[PDB]
Amino acid sequence: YYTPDYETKDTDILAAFRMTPQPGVPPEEAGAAVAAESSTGTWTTVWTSLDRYKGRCYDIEPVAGEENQYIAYVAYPLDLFEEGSVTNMFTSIVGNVFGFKALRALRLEDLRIPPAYSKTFQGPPHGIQVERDKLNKYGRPLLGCTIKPKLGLSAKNYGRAVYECLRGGLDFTKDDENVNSQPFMRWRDRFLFVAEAIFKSQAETGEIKGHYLNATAGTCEEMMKRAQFARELGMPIVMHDYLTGGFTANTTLAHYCRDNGLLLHIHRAMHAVIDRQRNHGIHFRVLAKALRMSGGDHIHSGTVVGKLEGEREVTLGFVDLLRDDYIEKDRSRGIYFTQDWVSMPGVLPVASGGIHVWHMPALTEIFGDDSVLQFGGGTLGHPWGNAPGAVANRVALEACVQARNEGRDLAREGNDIIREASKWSPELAAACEVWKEIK
Amino acid sequence: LTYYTPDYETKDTDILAAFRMTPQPGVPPEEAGAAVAAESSTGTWTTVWTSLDRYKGRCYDIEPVAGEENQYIAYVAYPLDLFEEGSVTNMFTSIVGNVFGFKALRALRLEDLRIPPAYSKTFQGPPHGIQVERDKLNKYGRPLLGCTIKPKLGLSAKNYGRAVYECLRGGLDFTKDDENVNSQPFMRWRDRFLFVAEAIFKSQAETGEIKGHYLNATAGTCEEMMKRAQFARELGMPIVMHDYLTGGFTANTTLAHYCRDNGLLLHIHRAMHAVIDRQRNHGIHFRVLAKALRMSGGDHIHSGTVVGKLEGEREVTLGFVDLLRDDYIEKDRSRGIYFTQDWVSMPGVLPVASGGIHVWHMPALTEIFGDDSVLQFGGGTLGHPWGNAPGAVANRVALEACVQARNEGRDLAREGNDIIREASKWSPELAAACEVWKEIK
Amino acid sequence: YYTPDYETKDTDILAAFRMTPQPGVPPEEAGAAVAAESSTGTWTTVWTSLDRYKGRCYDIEPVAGEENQYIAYVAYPLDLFEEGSVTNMFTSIVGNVFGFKALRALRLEDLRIPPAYSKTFQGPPHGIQVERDKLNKYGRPLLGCTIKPKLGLSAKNYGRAVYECLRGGLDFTKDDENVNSQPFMRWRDRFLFVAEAIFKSQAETGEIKGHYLNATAGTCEEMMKRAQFARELGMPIVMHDYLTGGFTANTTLAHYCRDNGLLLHIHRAMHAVIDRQRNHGIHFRVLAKALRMSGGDHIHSGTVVGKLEGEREVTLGFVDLLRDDYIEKDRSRGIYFTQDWVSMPGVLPVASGGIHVWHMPALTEIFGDDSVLQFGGGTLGHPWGNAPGAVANRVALEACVQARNEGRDLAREGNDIIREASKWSPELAAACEVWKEIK
Amino acid sequence: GTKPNSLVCANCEGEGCVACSQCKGGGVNLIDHFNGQFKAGALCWLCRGKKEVLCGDCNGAGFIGGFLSTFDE
């Protein structure tokens, strides 16, 4: 298998994993066994012309800093995959490779998809440029919030909190991941009360508002029923969970949204079981590429306002993969291959966690005005209530955007901008007394 | 406050779980437990955002694992009103959606679950089961046999059907298809189905026995998946096949529901599972995914051979095999069982053995599993020096030899090599195979 | 059978009937014959393992006050019943037990349904808490009336009386039980004229009003046609008769209402042929439990005003079974088993008969503000017309609610509270001259 | 934010609430804040007559590491 003189073609799928061979196994022998245990399962021409229907290792590097670590490269032919199927791609590259005993740990890192294979997929339903035109919002990042705790509330009372937050100045409102249909609140009458509050808040401010409605179900017949009822009421956006529902069900929902004009929001649940350890699993940057091809408009990515050097580059690395059109090779940021998306729409990233007013300058400078910021306890915890709480967040945001368009460093001048702003807004003042400043 | 209630008694309508934990150096163990019960539910230990009260989970027990200083077992109980009836996705989303991202720990692993009878009655279960399928196939008293066309690849449809026809006439019962073969430029599916159906009838018309073949139905969309299932029903095929880990539970439940309403048999193939249940300190044990499938629906499942397992092992496998097949299982800590389970008359699931096996491994497989399993041969059937049809006769002749002796009071354990040799004398196909594959002594 | 030491498990269905054995039959041998004549039909193991597929008697008590009377207890296995079917439950427990020639009279009294069997049913469509949110009415019982006699009126004239009553202050308006489709008035043009009057009365008062539309039919194809036409006009509630139509047809209608957002009203006709005598038939408290599982929001119970001690407890007993969630054993109120409904929605009871203004303090104190009161001649018999008749009832009801929110007793004051109120309302005054005071 | 070998939040000692400094646990303005907006004898301008606010370190959790007091990662 190992063909160090091999030259990849323009229609080949490439992969790269790291390996931890057992004591005794030579490195050059282990690499060739991974390429075979992924395709045919043999090193001889006894059962055979087949020849071209196999994989091959063409490169091996030693990892610096650890003696027992290597990087391998494998190439696959194009005719081994079914067009338009994401399930087939995973079941072929990785169907049985982590059960190999001669190793101790394995981890997939990156993949290169040639343009001759990406053209058979549909991609995101709308994208970034099209979505901004439907909402008529330009210049700054969007805002949102989620009713997190509570639980056990009635349908009437659930719609009360939605109306208060939207009237304050927010843009979106979320739901809870583990809320589909339960004895204390059924799904049909929760949809009715939510849609009533959206129309009322749209007549006082004259701006477009929305709310993510969960559409996960146990069967495909039931999942499609909840999506059609959201179109009769004229709702603009829905929500799905693509890691516990499966890839087959996610592709069906993406096609429906494109044919009816709906926006899709994606949540990543259960992901921590796969991509937390440093020596076993599949890196998150691979699952992000599969989501772009399958379909989606938003995705969760996590905050980095709490990281340091070495980090904050891996996360910044795969943010470019979700928005750009041509990404060059860069090993310092965790990119092993050059990728071209031949004019495919991008995906908007979402940042969340425990954040507050004193974090405004940090998030704006890093992500830019191309993301969505979500708040949890930083909105419902205001001493005056829900509606005054949403006023504080809006004010702070506008301040940062304005300063930036005057040549004022947001990395240094930050606590100052917030303070001078709490000198003409009583709501912000109160909030600045509950939460503490940032060194 | 209830968080860590070392006295609370559970009720008959509660779902219980048990995970092992590896706390960081300094974190008291009794406090880490309560944090797992909160991150898997509300997320708070105070009544500030709160009557909620009953909508929370609670830890009620902690034990230290012997042999390791940093290891503990925690027990959590959940109320019944937190789950949606008939949904398997919701249970997995609720129980573990944000628990492995916790940083106050180092490693976590879920081990077991208990499902009360008040929750199992809202599911359908396997379409047919064990007893019903044996009446449909009219086979009694011995395990079934099968074979798979593992290598090959790139063959035309006619050549693909020729091998199936040759193998089925030798004496085998089933025949399988490669996992990574759905629809490719070198061979599409609508003609492979036709050729397999043509071969099956010709094979059946001679020996006068019912035969079958697993047809792959995995697809990229649910519209395409359901199209390949009705075509198999039009031709009168008895069985199909699906992958339930890369496809998802939502697509599997619909397939099970369709199979129940039309009289088909479902074969389940586990794939990608090695990424989850390989390490000893992170992931989810396979015995939980085995219980999930029984509620979701299925007839066959891949488990794992045990004759290569030594003392200490071979116990957990025999435990979850009993969990798959039996109706009432008692608590036994030596076999990896932490809870008492009752299935209130739900049908069982047939386990399937596989790997690299030959004729000299027959008595051991028959002794352990019993006559309630399916044995699959890979390179041990197409590697015969004379062909495929003579290759199947050796396996068929060997299996019968073992069963008969067993029914006469002979020990298939100590003996076995002798039994095999005595049959080779009167069987030339049994011989030759004993000149290519050696015997274990 | 007769197994005294037998201990019932948590997945068994229990029943209790009273018996009147013929002279000569010992009591202990008669009990065992009922358990057999209900399941297998034999006392020997000749046709047989079956064993577990049979019923068993485990207790016998003598009834005080009558020498020839006993109470028997029978237990049944869980695997004998089909999930989600009410028809199968009745045809198995009682398919041939009243034809036994060794007895003279039999009567079923109570049943216990384990939680492992109730979870396979859907239950009421909405319930109590959800229904009150759809109507936006809190703190007081609802009011209604029914056009009882009349007959032969045209469709135009039929809708005239509906508009008058609703404008006066009433909440609901009923129809007549024996009115489905007749030569003097067809069903389609009666629906059209009724819906027109509802919209008009909703613009003068700004309150939600409704009217029960009869949907009983001779065929299931015709019954579903009348239910879909009521959704196009946006009507909120329908009506059905569940004792002459059957249990199979009632379950089909309940499923449709849940999927479309409609309220169900249940009337009990022909019931007097089954549960009037004291020694033969099936008690009404059993048929009430079957209705909760099948589906329904309202049900007729009966005015308990003219009842004495000893009575007024059997009625109060099964009212709790329709509204509570956990009921304990109490033999003095006719409850033989402890029942748990594991979070199932409740049912609103309805009281009717010949009632008037002087009967207002009595009904409010007993039922509470969780019921519906219906009037017949106590509205259309006013000396000034229909619209004024509904004002009297509305005025009187508000007087009672306020008094209770002050500490005044409604079991004494009563007559007083009413008089003082007829000192500022000319309509109530006139009504207090047609009907006589209550001693 | 944790305490000696314990995930408990120190600022609130596992409570999820803190006293209102302005009114100093009283419930009425003592000085004229917001110049011409808050008097020096009217209801407290922050808590508004409760003398208790939510803790910032932990947004009402009582413990530190969690999904209500951490940056998503």
Please answer whether residues C284 and C275 qualify as being in contact, where contact means their C-beta atoms are separated by less than 8 angstroms: yes
Q: Which of A182, A185, A188, A232 to mutate to test the interface with C (most CBs of C within 10 A)?
A: A188
- Report helix angle C284-294 to C247-260, nearest 10: 40
Strand partners, C75: C14, C56
The answer to whether the Cα torsion of A197, A203, A206, A208 is positive or negative is positive
The whole-angstrom separation of Cα C380 and Cα C390 is 9
A285 vs A287: CA distance, rounded Å: 6
* Distance (Å) from the alpha carbon of D46 to chain A's nearest alpha carbon: 6
CA angle A200, A204, A210 (to 5 degrees): 55
C-alpha to C-alpha distance for C314 and C301, rounded to whole angstroms: 12
Helix (H) or strand (E) holding D18: strand D17-18
Q: Which candidate, B294, B243, B288, B231, places its Cα nearest to that of B267?
A: B243
Contacts of A275 (CB under 8 A, 6+ apart): A281, A282, A283, A284, A287
| Two tokens, residue A424 | 């003409």
Tokens 């007793």, residue? C409
Nearest-angstrom CA–CA distance, C201 and B147: 77
Which residues are CB-contacts of C222 (< 8 A; sequence separation ≥ 6)? none
CA C373 – CA C360 distance, rounded (Å): 10
Contacts of B85 in chain C (CB under 8 A): 119
d(CA A355, CA A175): 18
| Cβ atoms of residues C15 and C93 within 8 Å | yes
Residue pair A57/A19 in contact (Cβ under 8 Å)? The answer is no
> B25 exposed, middle or buried (CB, 10 Å; 0-12, 13-18, 19+)?
exposed
**Helix (H), strand (E) at residue C111:** strand C103-112
Instruction: Give C370's Cβ-side CA count (13 Å radius).
Output: 15
User: Is C375 within 8 Å of C142 (Cβ atoms)?
Assistant: no
Distances (CA, A) of B190 to B216, B240, C230, D20: 12, 15, 48, 75
Is A144 an interface residue toward D (CB < 8 Å)? Answer: no
Active-site residue identified among A265, A267, A283, A382: A267
Q: CA A437 to CA A396: how far, in whole Å? A: 14
| CA–CA distance, C335 with A109 (Å, rounded to integer) | 68
Q: What is the DSSP letter of D3?
A: B
Distance CA C370, CA B270 (A): 55
Which H helix or E strand runs over C250?
helix C247-260
Give the relative orientation of helices B389-406 and B157-168 as an angle to the nearest 10 degrees: 30
Tell the residue number behind the tokens 């073609």, with chain if given: A9
* Distance in angstroms (rounded) separating the CA atoms of residues A149 and B42: 7
Cβ(A346)–Cβ(D61) below 8 Å: no
Q: Measured between alpha carbons, how far is residue B364 from residues A363, B262, B352, B402, C406 in Å?
A: 64, 38, 15, 10, 86
Q: Measure the N-to-C terminal CA separation of chain D; round to a whole number of Å.
A: 20
B32 to chain D nearest CA, in Å? 8
- Give which of C175, C178, C167 is closest to C145, Cα–Cα: C175
Place of tokens 């990896």: B336
Q: Residue B135's CB: how many other CB atoms inside 10 A?
A: 10
Cα atoms found within 13 Å of the Cα of residue A36, Cβ hemisphere only:
14
The amino acid at A147: I
Angle, helix B249-262 to helix B88-95, in steps of 10 degrees = 160
Distance CA(B210)–CA(B236), nearest Å, equals: 12
The answer to whether B35 contacts D7, with C-beta atoms less than 8 Å apart, is yes
C241/C249 Cα distance (integer angstroms): 10
Which residues is C372 bridged to in the sheet?
Answer: C142, C350
Q: CB–CB of B110/B74 below 8 Å?
A: no
Q: d(Cα C347, Cα C264) in Å, to the nearest integer?
A: 11
Three-state DSSP at C56 gives strand
Report the C-alpha gap between A40 and A46 in whole angstroms.
12
Instruction: Select from C354, C247, C357, C377 the least CA-distant residue to C302.
Output: C354
Backbone angles phi, psi at C131, to 5 degrees: -65, -40
C101 in active site: no
DSSP track, A267-288: E--SGGGTSSSSSSEE-HHHHH
Continuous segment of H or E residues that includes residue A228: helix A220-232
CA angle, B200 then B202 then B205, to 5°: 105
Angle C78-C79-C84 (CA atoms, 0-180°, nearest 5)? 80
Kind plus residue range of the DSSP H or E element containing C327: strand C326-327
CB within 8 Å of C45: residues ≥ 6 apart: none
**Sheet architecture: strand order including A13-21:** A56-62, A70-76, A13-21, A103-112, A281-282
Q: Is B101 on the interface with D (CB under 8 A)?
A: yes
SS3 for B50? Answer: coil
Residues D58, D67: Cα–Cα separation, whole Å: 10
Distance of CA C219 to the CA centre of its chain: 24
Which residues of chain B are within 8 Å of residue C79 when distances are taken between CB atoms? 345
Written as six digits, the tokens of B86 are 């008939």
DSSP assignment string, B360-372: GGHHHHHHHH-SS
CA B126/CA B293 separation, integer angstroms = 9
Pairing relation of β-strands A13-21 and A70-76?
Answer: antiparallel
**DSSP category for residue A209:** -
Asked whether A124 and A296 are in contact (CB, 8 A), the reply is yes
Looking up tokens 């079934």 gives: B144
Query: DSSP state, A398?
Result: H
Q: What is the least distance, in Å, from the CA of A158 to any CA of chain C? A: 12
**HEC letters along A342-359:** CCCCCCEEEECECCCHHH
Q: Which alpha helices (H) appear in A233-329, and where do they start and end?
A: 247-260, 284-294, 314-323
Radius of gyration of chain D (CA): 16
Residues C64, C54: Cα–Cα separation, whole Å:
31
Structure tokens at B110: 């879920």
Contact between A253 and A240 (Cβ < 8 Å): yes
Q: Is C240 left (phi over 0), alpha (psi -120 to 50) or beta?
A: beta
Reading phi first (left if > 0) and then psi (alpha if -120 to 50, else beta), residue B328 is in beta
Q: Is B83 exposed, middle or buried (0-12, 13-18, 19+ CB in 10 A)?
A: buried
**CA-to-CA separations, B26 to A254, B19, B30, D5, in angstroms, rounded:** 48, 20, 12, 5
Handedness of CA C173, C176, C365, C288 (dihedral sign): negative
Distances (CA, A) of C121 to A302, B69, B83, B412, C84: 43, 50, 16, 52, 5
Active site annotation includes B103: no
What the block records as the tokens of A356 is 């507050």
Q: What do you get for the CA distance between the two ends of chain B, in Å?
A: 62
Nearest to B196 by CA among B180, B219, B212: B212
C280 burial (CB, 10 Å; 0-12 / 13-18 / 19+) is middle
B277 Cα distance to chain centroid: 14
H or E stretch including A432?
helix A426-434
Strands C213-214 and C237-241, sheet pairing: parallel
Residue B398: partners with Cβ closer than 8 Å, 6 or more residues away: B359, B362, B420, B423, B430
The DSSP code sequence of C193-245 is HHHHHHHHHHHHH-------EE---SSHHHHHHHHHHHHHTT--EEEEETTTS
CB atoms within 10 A of CB B201: 11
* β-strands C213-214, C339-340 pairing: unpaired
CA B441 to CA B415: how far, in whole Å? Answer: 10
Nearest to D60 among B28, B48, B101 (CB): B48
Contact call for residues A270 and A244 (beta carbons, < 8 A): yes
B46 vs D contacts (CB less than 8 Å):
14-17, 60-62
Cα gap C180→A25, rounded to integer Å = 87
CA distance A162 to A155: 11
HSE-up of B64 (CA within 13 Å, CB side)?
8
Query: Which chains are within 8 Å of B by 3+ CB pairs?
Result: A, C, D
Q: Based on the number of CB atoms within 10 Å of its own CB, is A4 exposed (0-12), middle (13-18) or buried (19 or more)? A: exposed
Among positive and negative, which fits the CA dihedral C401, C406, C409, C414? Answer: negative
Query: Is-contact B133 B265, C-beta < 8 A?
Result: yes
Q: Locate tokens 């008492």: which residue?
A: B340
Catalytic pick among C126, C209, C267, C298: C267
Q: Give, as one character, the DSSP assignment of residue D54.
A: E
Give B-chain residues touching A184 at CB under 8 angstroms. Answer: 81
Subunit contact A433:D46, Cβ cutoff 8 A: yes
| Residues on chain D touching B31 (C-beta within 8 angstroms) | 6-8
Which residue is it, tokens 């079914």?
A: A82
- Dihedral angle at the C-alpha atoms of B313, B314, B320, B326, nearest 10 degrees? -150
Q: How far apart are CA B210 and CA A28, in angstroms?
A: 50
C431 and C399 Cβ atoms separated by less than 8 Å: no
Q: Cα torsion for B306, A97, B19, B337, to the nearest 10°?
A: -10
Q: In this complex, does chain C touch chain D, defined as having at least 3 beta-carbon pairs under 8 Å apart?
A: no
**Cβ burial B403-423 (10 Å sphere, 16+ → b, else e):** eebbeeebebeeebeebbeeb
Name every residue whose Cβ is closer than 8 Å to that of residue B391 and which is 6 or more positions away in sequence. B170, B381, B382, B383, B384, B429, B433
CA distance C123 to C125: 6
Residues from chain C contacting residue A197 (CB–CB below 8 Å)? none
- Kindly write down the DSSP assignment for every residue of B318-355, as one continuous string: HHHHHHHH-SEE--BGGGTB-S-EE-SS----EEEE-S
Token pair 């740990």 is at which residue?
A: A105
SS (H, E, C) B117-175: HHHHCCCCCCCCCCHHHHHHHCCCCCCEEEEECCCCCCCCHHHHHHHHHHHHCCCCCCC
Which chain D residue lies closest to B97 (C-alpha atoms)? D67
The distance in angstroms from the start CA to the end CA of chain A is 57
Q: How far is it, in rounded angstroms, from Cα A230 to Cα A237?
A: 9
3-class SS of residue A172: strand
Rounded-to-integer distance, Cα A242 and Cα A250, Å: 6
Cβ pair A57, A31 in contact under 8 A = yes
CA distance C140 to C372: 10
Does the distance separating the beta carbons of B276 and A273 come in below 8 Å? yes
Phi-psi region of A281 (alpha: psi -120 to 50; beta: other; left: phi over 0): left
3-state secondary structure of B94: helix
CA A3/CA A16 separation, integer angstroms: 15
Give bridge partners of residue C62 from the DSSP assignment. Answer: C70
